[PDB]
Ligand binder design. Structure first.
Ligand code: IYC
Length: 264
């Protein structure tokens, strides 16, 4: 057992924030607001449930959801930090959605690209990168999460690169693709990529060279970044280090003459 092993009674689960096990907002050692991901026995394999905690032990970054502790004895628990604003998907679709603008939305994208550039230096792949897996706290802080499929190197189709959805080639540039889809989520405020298309139709058109057009009120200089994320050859895609640098200097180097619109 590791040093992440805490007593099974040191947690006081309270409010459930969504379930599938479930997700609870509770207490740790008396005073720590935490988020407790739990394994509700569906007789699910705990080695397949602690695999999400195995990767979360080696990844520490200010833009990643910080694991707090693990309970590896049935029933299984996973304790992480509590994000006060919930998932980014619900945030873009919630009441704050209509008020978000391009300066704030690009900032959230630079935080995601910062945390996605961290694990790019650690030689890991996330494999389920999407706004439904990004979590928001106060001050518009976005930490990527849901490492239940992340693993060290050696489907939700609409977010996956073709070579990963087709040939299982989940690499550092297969998530760069999902980042470009994440940029369409942020620019449309939570809308589903490829409107009106089913998973099979997306797989057919993406393999035929089809790419999503420019979101309304989105600058072509940002949709160009999405196309670079959606390049067929995985090595043509930009690094997350370039992605984080691009989005941090966006309104000085790329769009210095940005004027706000009704939506962006
Ligand atoms: C225990 C880990 N998870 C589960 C989780 C989600 C939603 C998206 C995610 F990428 C993750 C992850 N990884 O759970 C959703 C069902 C609901 N969870 C929350 O609204 C939440 C929150 N407000 N802070 N916070 C912190 C952690 C946390 N979930 C939350």
């Amino acid at each position: 057992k590791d040093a992440w092993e805490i007593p099974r009674e040191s947690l006081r689960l309270e409010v459930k924030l969504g379930q599938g096990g479930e997700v609870w907002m509770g207490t740790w050692n008396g005073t720590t607001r935490v988020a407790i991901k739990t394994l509700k026995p569906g007789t699910m394999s705990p080695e397949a449930f602690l695999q999400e905690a195995q990767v979360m032990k080696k990844l520490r970054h200010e833009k990643l959801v910080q694991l707090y502790a693990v309970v590896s004895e049935e029933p299984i628990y996973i304790v992480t930090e509590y994000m006060s604003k919930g998932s980014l998907l619900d945030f873009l679709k919630g009441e704050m959605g209509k008020y978000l603008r391009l300066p704030q939305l690009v900032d959230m994208a630079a935080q995601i690209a910062s945390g996605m550039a961290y694990v790019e230096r650690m030689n890991y792949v996330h494999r389920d990168l999407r706004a439904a897996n990004i979590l928001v706290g106060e001050n518009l802080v976005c930490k990527v999460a849901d490492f239940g499929l992340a693993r060290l190197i050696e489907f939700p189709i609409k977010w996956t690169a073709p070579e990963a959805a087709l040939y299982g080639r989940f690499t550092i540039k297969s998530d760069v693709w999902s980042f470009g889809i994440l940029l369409t989520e942020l620019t449309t405020k939570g809308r589903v990529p490829y409107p009106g298309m089913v998973n099979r139709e997306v797989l057919d058109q993406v393999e035929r060279g089809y790419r999503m057009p420019c979101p309304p009120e989105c600058p072509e200089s940002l949709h160009d970044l999405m196309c670079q994320c959606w390049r067929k050859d995985p090595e043509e895609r930009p690094t997350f280090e370039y992605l984080q640098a691009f989005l941090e200097d966006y309104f000085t180097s790329t769009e210095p003459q940005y004027q706000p619109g009704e939506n962006l």
